[PDB]
């Protein structure tokens, strides 16, 4: 019950079966006289090793997440990926996926899964220094130099997506995501004052949103627009967790 093709809803985890073939991860394992395998997940190394285990496993990705950061969870950003493939799907836009991700964080890993499990190739961004350096040497360590292309941006300047889509000016991208930063309404009205613009070069315009309350102007801006935009809002898996998912398009060739 987390996602119709999510790999992750009916096949969770088997962490004796990771315990046995990872051995680093087996050392946050607290195997016992309980007969299973018992696993903290309090801390944040075992969340790290997690993450970095199933990526190994699943995805064929050796992936490295430095202290101090975001620890992604592969099945809710794996979720997010199939959400974007149904759209991309409904409107038949699944020849030559390219496709820009901002705000990549230190993994880049919405680049690394969409290239891995759907043959996606991407525009990476962030604003972070040691966030990008870690990028590059995941992108590296992969072998998806030829897939990913990570560029830095300076946070300064208004724009989120016109400093990027430069990279490339004969393509008209499909899609976007983003994990904005943690307010976030200036940041995703900047994405949408870039959205007023290249109108139908991205077809798709999608971002994930964490604060709860900053649905209502966003929308508002939206609607704004009237007829010339549409937009669908999305919501994601495990239950207690709080993000949504908010997409639009000018297009009127793509149907959301």
């Known amino acids: 019950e987390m996602h119709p093709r999510n790999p992750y809803r009916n096949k969770p985890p088997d962490f004796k079966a990771l315990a046995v073939e990872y051995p680093e991860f087996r050392k946050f394992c607290q195997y016992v006289s309980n007969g299973k395998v018992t696993f903290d997940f309090k801390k944040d190394a075992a969340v790290r090793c997690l993450t970095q285990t199933l990526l190994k496993k699943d995805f ?30 409904a409107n038949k836009l699944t020849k030559n996926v390219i496709g820009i ?31 990008v350096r870690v ?12 897939s990913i292309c990570v560029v830095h941006v300076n946070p300064d300047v208004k724009t989120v997506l016109m400093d990027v889509v430069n990279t490339i000016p004969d393509t008209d991208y499909a899609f976007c995501m983003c994990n904005p930063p943690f307010g976030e309404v200036a940041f995703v009205n900047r994405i949408i004052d870039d959205s007023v613009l290249l109108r139908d070069r991205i077809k798709i315009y999608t971002t994930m949103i964490g604060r709860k309350s900053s649905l209502k102007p966003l929308q508002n801006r939206l609607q704004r627009f009237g007829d010339d935009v549409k937009i669908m809002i999305s919501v994601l898996n495990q239950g207690k967790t709080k993000r949504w998912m908010l997409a639009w398009t000018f297009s009127k060739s793509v149907s959301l």
């Open 60 to 89: 064929n990705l050796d992936v490295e997440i430095p202290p101090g950061h975001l620890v992604p969870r592969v099945p809710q950003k794996l979720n997010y990926c199939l959400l974007i493939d149904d759209l991309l799907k």
């Open 135 to 146: 990028a590059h040497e995941n992108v590296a360590k992969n072998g998806l130099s030829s």
């Open 101 to 131: 991700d901002i705000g990549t964080g230190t993994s880049c890993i919405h680049a690394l899964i969409g290239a891995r499990q759907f043959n996606w190739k991407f525009i990476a961004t962030d604003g972070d220094e040691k966030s």
